[PDB]
Ligand binder design. Structure first.
Ligand SMILES: CCCCCCCCCCCCCC(=O)SCCNC(=O)CCNC(=O)[C@H](O)C(C)(C)COP(=O)(O)OP(=O)(O)OC[C@H]1O[C@@H](n2cnc3c(N)ncnc32)[C@H](O)[C@@H]1OP(=O)(O)O
Ligand SMILES: Cc1cnc(NC(=O)c2cccc3[nH]c(-c4cc(Cl)ccc4N4CCNCC4)nc23)s1
Ligand SMILES: [Cl-]
Ligand SMILES: [Cl-]
Length: 426
């Protein structure tokens, strides 16, 4: 039984609707709480200065997440996001200073809480909007189970609404309310010895370390040339590549895609905002198409689909006309081995956005797997989003533990396959 989420404009697990529809759950442009939320006495909010990678805030935030952010089911691994990664993930085009929210102990100046939002643009069926992604919610372990998380969530909500934004996207490794999709984790083992020594996998009784190495090898043959890291000047071509990709997989007509309802222009009125409601006749109308995805302008492409060592890798394929025709990308996050002092961390690649036009998605992922190996990644992680299942099938990926639940705040999305979802959170 929820005490917080049952009061929020999200679809509840017991939602009893017999129709598939889209649109805002509520249109409440001026009725939200505007006063800052109270923290326990002795604590204070601050805008986290992640704008200087050398800042004390950045050091405190890095340390908070390193020691208290997400752990796996059995508390063997914990994420160790680098400062360079956090800068790339949070200082995005259009970011607001007050969407990076810390909690500090007044007497000691020690940071004990963080929550972030980043701005993104999303298409949801026939609508388009500026929205937010909430991520990196973290409370110091000594302060857990004291209901601080709803305080942080309400305060980031207030800060997002003060920017005239009333929706958000977020994921969680557990069920909270009703998710609009569920992602499955898939792991491609790259460095077998390192992952055995870390305890991520073990040596099966019918195998050996040498046969395990042999089985998990990234296939070497069948290389496709023409791939190269992207550079800044690619941004326009990459932006066009994504447009054609989303146009290819659209779940609405061509005319609708060129005439999306801009929710930004109507979310100020309970009457005009009603235009965003859309009844879907059949859920099969969405099969094999993309229903919700991020939208990238050229500035966004330049920031996200770049190449920063140990953070983000983006390659493009050119054709004989030197036109970009394909793209693969993955980001890199280190994880700490909690129960290990001598082998403390491991580098993990995570599939980002991938577009295959001149080769198969399998061929592209094989090139990306080799590039991940050459970037010293110990494993390659992917979700069954977009068309990734085509690659995950008939492959050597191994299923992960748990599931990734996708949520949208204050919007209705029918439950859809993760193949219909083009939203990757960091
Ligand atoms: C318009 C704009 C809207 C913007 C806002 C949109 C929503 C964004 C929402 C957040 C997006 C997060 C995106 C990411 O970053 S996902 C990763 C979340 N972070 C971690 O897992 C790191 C390690 N764990 C922790 O730091 C704490 O355990 C956290 C802080 C997670 C909870 O701390 P604590 O363990 O000390 O708990 P509590 O007693 O204070 O609070 C209990 C209440 O909190 C609800 N709860 C617990 N965990 C989560 C969770 N991960 N998402 C949403 N709700 C959560 C729980 O259901 C209950 O409510 P109810 O069940 O009684 O109702
Ligand atoms: C040696 C190791 C290899 N992989 C490791 N993963 C962990 O320890 C881990 C712990 C807790 C939660 C996790 N979620 C994911 C993940 C996995 C895949 Cl396949 C695709 C996407 C994923 N996430 C990343 C976090 N944001 C949401 C999406 N991984 C973890 S440890
Ligand atoms: Cl679920
Ligand atoms: Cl499971």
């Amino acid at each position: 039984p929820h005490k917080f989420w049952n009061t929020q404009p999200v679809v509840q697990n017991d939602d009893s609707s017999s129709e598939y529809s889209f649109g805002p759950i509520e249109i409440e442009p001026d009725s939200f709480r505007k006063e800052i939320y109270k923290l326990p006495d002795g604590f204070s909010w601050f805008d986290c200065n992640l704008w200087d990678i050398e800042s004390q805030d950045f050091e405190d935030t890095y340390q908070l997440l390193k020691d208290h952010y997400v752990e796996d089911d059995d508390s063997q691994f914990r994420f160790n996001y680098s400062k360079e990664f956090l800068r790339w993930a949070l200082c995005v085009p259009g970011q607001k200073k007050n969407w990076l929210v810390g909690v500090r102990v007044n007497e000691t100046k020690k940071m004990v809480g963080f929550i972030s939002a980043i701005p993104i643009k999303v298409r949801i069926h026939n609508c388009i909007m500026n929205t937010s992604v909430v991520n990196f919610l973290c409370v110091h372990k000594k302060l857990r189970s004291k209901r601080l998380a709803p305080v942080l969530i309400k305060e980031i909500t207030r800060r997002i609404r003060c920017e005239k934004i009333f929706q958000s996207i977020y994921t969680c490794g557990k069920n909270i309310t009703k998710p609009f999709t569920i992602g499955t984790y898939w792991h491609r083992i790259i460095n077998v010895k390192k992952l055995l020594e870390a305890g991520f996998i073990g040596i099966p009784r019918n195998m050996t370390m040498s046969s395990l190495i042999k089985y998990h090898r990234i296939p070497a043959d069948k290389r496709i040339e023409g791939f190269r890291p992207s550079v800044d000047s690619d941004a326009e071509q990459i932006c066009k590549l994504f447009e054609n990709y989303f146009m290819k997989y659209k779940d609405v007509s061509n005319e609708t895609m060129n005439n999306l309802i801009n929710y930004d222009e109507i979310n100020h009125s309970k009457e005009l905002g009603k235009q965003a409601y859309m009844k879907l006749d059949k859920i099969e109308d969405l099969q094999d198409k993309i229903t919700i995805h991020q939208c990238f302008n050229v500035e966004d492409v330049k920031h996200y689909f770049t190449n920063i060592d140990k953070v983000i890798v983006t390659y493009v394929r050119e054709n004989k006309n030197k036109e970009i025709t394909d793209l693969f990308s993955f980001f890199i996050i280190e994880s700490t081995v909690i129960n290990n002092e001598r082998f403390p961390t491991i580098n993990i690649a995570y599939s980002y956005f991938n577009i295959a036009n001149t080769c198969s998605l399998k061929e592209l992922f094989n090139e990306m797997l080799i590039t991940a190996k050459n970037n010293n990644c110990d494993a390659f992680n992917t979700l069954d989003l977009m068309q990734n299942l085509q690659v995950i099938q008939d492959s050597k990926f191994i299923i992960g533990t748990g599931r990734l639940r996708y949520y949208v705040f204050n919007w209705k999305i029918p439950q859809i396959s993760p193949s219909n979802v083009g939203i990757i959170l960091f």
